[PDB]
Amino acid sequence: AMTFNIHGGYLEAIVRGYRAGLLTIVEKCTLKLVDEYKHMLPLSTFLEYITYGHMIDNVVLIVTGRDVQELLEKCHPLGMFDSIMRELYRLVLVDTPLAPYFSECITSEDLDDMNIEIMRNTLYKAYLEDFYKFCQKLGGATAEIMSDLLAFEADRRAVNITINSIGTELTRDDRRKLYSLYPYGHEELAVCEDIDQVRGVMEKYPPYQSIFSKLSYGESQMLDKAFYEEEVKRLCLAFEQQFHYGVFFAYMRLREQEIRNLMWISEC
Template sequence: MFNTKDGFLEATVRGCVGGFLRTEDYSNLQQCETVEDIKLYLTSTDYGSLLQNEASPTHPSLIVRCCLKKIVQDFSFFDLVKAAEPLSTFLQYLKYGYMIDNIVLMVTGAMHEREVTELLDKCHPLGMFDSIASLGAVSNLRELHRIVLVDTPISAYFGECFRDENLDEVNIEILRNSLYKAYLKDFFRLSQMLGGLTAEVMKEILCFEADRRAVNITINSIGTELSRDDRQKLFSDFGHMHPEGQRDLALCRDFEQVVSVIVNSTYQNILQKSTSEEMNIDKVFYETEVMKCSSMFAQQFHYGIFYAYLKLREQEVRNLMWLSECIAQDQKYRIVDGVISIF
């Protein structure tokens, strides 16, 4: 039954895996002297058709923009093929996280009096919706929901963060994390309802995502006015660190305590190479995500590979952005710090 309804799109995604940059590609890219050299090298990859007509000079932002176009191109194909239910709903859920990021970007930019057109250019293309340009006109959460977001798919997520407060920087971050909490809970519900191997692989990756967000929320809120109770309210209601690990994270007062909580959790092995720098925490979590997503392709007949493909493309965008910026700033020695090979 799976092959009859979804087999073609699953095979398409598996075929796209061959287009990822390999370890040898990153080794070659590190030898580039300019961003223009990076562009020239990428023209022989899956990004070639998107880069070949771009005018010089080449900037890192151009590389990133073309990488994002590749992601949109792939998802547009899925829409063109018209995925059957419930896969079509699953694919729509993959876009909701980008919608949340775009909302926060637009509202934060408007608060700092940035131009709407400038902000729209920075929005993720998979997270666009009709009324997004109106976000610059709202001043509190109630207006944000009533005027702009009531007709969007993520409107229901405001039930867990609905307060009539001004949109200052603290409340915007609380909004972001509250929306993500509601989104992950809903996505988890959907994936478990689908059952089978999809439920199994998505449970693992969404629990990981919930745990990573709990760690990041804790690190980012240390030294701020956010109380421990408010911090814990932003954690998801599931995950490998729920509930004991989350309770410990809520009590952390410095970075070393966060590391201690992670070491005593199911993630103790991923910190073996880390030091006391927060940037390494980000990297080891990204490395773990790449490993988990790559392993999804070893199994068949499940929707998790669509999630995995998107996340691996995201990592490739981060890799190329970091690599391009390092070369543009003549800091090639730092490339190894931010690039994570995928296959």
Template structure:
């Protein structure tokens, strides 16, 4: 197999899919509040990845081709044949389409993990919130480096 950028992305997405599915099964085995809360967080992550991959695929299609929408509909129908659970796709999870709104939704879900007791989700949520802090710092440093201090609040997602 040729290890070009596309194959690496496919490999990365396939590995991440396997990781999410294995981690989901592990959380289900734990049961209780951990399974309940992690199911929601992992489903949100899976939905976000599915939407990002679908949008990325659509961006790869030439806009001048006559069957642009037709191919997208065909791809979606084939995805439904492969994974019928997409039919019950919860649209409220995908109502936010901007990157900032998706991150804000993720932060809300991770903050909710701290409202229950006696589960392991707080460790996962803590790490995800730390990742958001790092994204915030990266955005702020990029704005400062590019002399765009007025845009700092455009993508900063506030935690707590």
């Protein structure tokens, strides 16, 4: 860990201070975090991967098609990267590693990215490409945490598939492929076709297990809410705040979690 002392100490210290500082309103908090990241602009690659995921979200918003520019402006500039329809997806593919996989999944551009079910697959492919970009950090403990989070997201996607997207006619092989090393292989949760049967298998996944617990809200939900408790746990993983490593992405995740908590509080 002497490399941190040799170089990069100041940036790591600034990132750690920004992380420890943070424990409508959500949009304002995300914009403040984006401004802090821009002022700041190893751990930098992890923060870039987190921003790449947050920009995959905004690109999937923009790849489709309604005041889309206004919607992108309302989002954080970290999520709505300034650099950034088939042409829209192709342009988003540049400067964003996550977008081209979303374009590949969405063969019909906006049509194959419908917010009902198709946009879920497009965003899943975008998240897979963002996870590949994170893996391009040559591994690490933070890379291990990112892999665990990606596995949780894949398990949530497979659970939501078997729960509701069967009516959306997403193929079981395709849905498993849509639901994404650890995220890549989730045959245990895809073995059970029944929604009730597949929910238990998805909860049996180590990211989902021991975190969801009763899971009155979470695993029962569709989209990517099955690992909601695991997301809070991964936020608590950053609460360790072990130094001499890359935790800028952890800092961004903690700031986003704080913004989400502030939004959930809303009035009072």
